[PDB]
Amino acid sequence: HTQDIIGGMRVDENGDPIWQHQSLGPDGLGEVGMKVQSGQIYINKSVPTNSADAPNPNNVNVQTQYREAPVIYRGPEPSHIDQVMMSVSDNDQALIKVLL
């Protein structure tokens, strides 16, 4: 019963964006309206580390387990996003689709 979170923009020296994080948006979903260059994570994603552990029927230690698996823009040329959507599948599972 552990989901995945889109927390983003870790801050440093009075400013949110890292050189990777100028185009990552307030929600963690990369902000529509601006370009991307190489590097420059545009979709942050964090996954629980107990991905195969058995569910313990209690509440003891689940507060910090999210290791990151971010999505990084490759390519030798700077591009833009076109637009981004989010939806759900046929089963209740979240869908994310961005197109450059």
Partner 1 sequence: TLKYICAECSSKLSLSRTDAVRCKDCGHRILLKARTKRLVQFEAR
Partner 2 sequence: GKKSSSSTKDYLTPPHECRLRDMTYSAPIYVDIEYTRGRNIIMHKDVEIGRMPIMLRSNKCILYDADESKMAKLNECPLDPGGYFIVNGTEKVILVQEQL
Partner 3 sequence: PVCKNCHGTEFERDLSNANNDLVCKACGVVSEDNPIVSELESREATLNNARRKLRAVSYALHIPEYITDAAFQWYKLALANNFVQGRRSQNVIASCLYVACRKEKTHHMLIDFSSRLQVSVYSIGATFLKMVKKLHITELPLADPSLFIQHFAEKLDLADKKIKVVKDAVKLAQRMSKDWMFEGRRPAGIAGACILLACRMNNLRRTHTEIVAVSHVAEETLQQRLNEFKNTKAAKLSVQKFRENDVEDGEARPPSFVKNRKKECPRNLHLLPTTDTYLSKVSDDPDNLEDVDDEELNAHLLNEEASKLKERIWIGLNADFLLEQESKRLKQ
Is the Cβ of residue 9 or residue 29 nearer to partner 1 in the bound state? 29
DSSP code for 12: B
Stretch that binds partner 3, among 9-17, 24-32, 43-51, 54-62 (CB under 8 A): 54-62
- Write the binding mask 60 to 89 for partner 2: x where contact by CB under 8 A, - elsewhere: -------------------------x-xxx
Binding of partner 2 by 92 (CB under 8 A): no
Question: Residues 11, 47, 52, CA angle at the centre, nearest 5°?
Answer: 155
d(CA 76, CA 99): 18
CB atoms within 10 A of CB 53: 10
Radius of gyration of the chain, Cα coordinates, nearest whole angstrom: 16
Total binding residues toward partner 2, as defined by CB under 8 A? 7
- Which residue ranges make up the site for partner 2 (CB under 8 A)? 85, 87-90, 95, 97
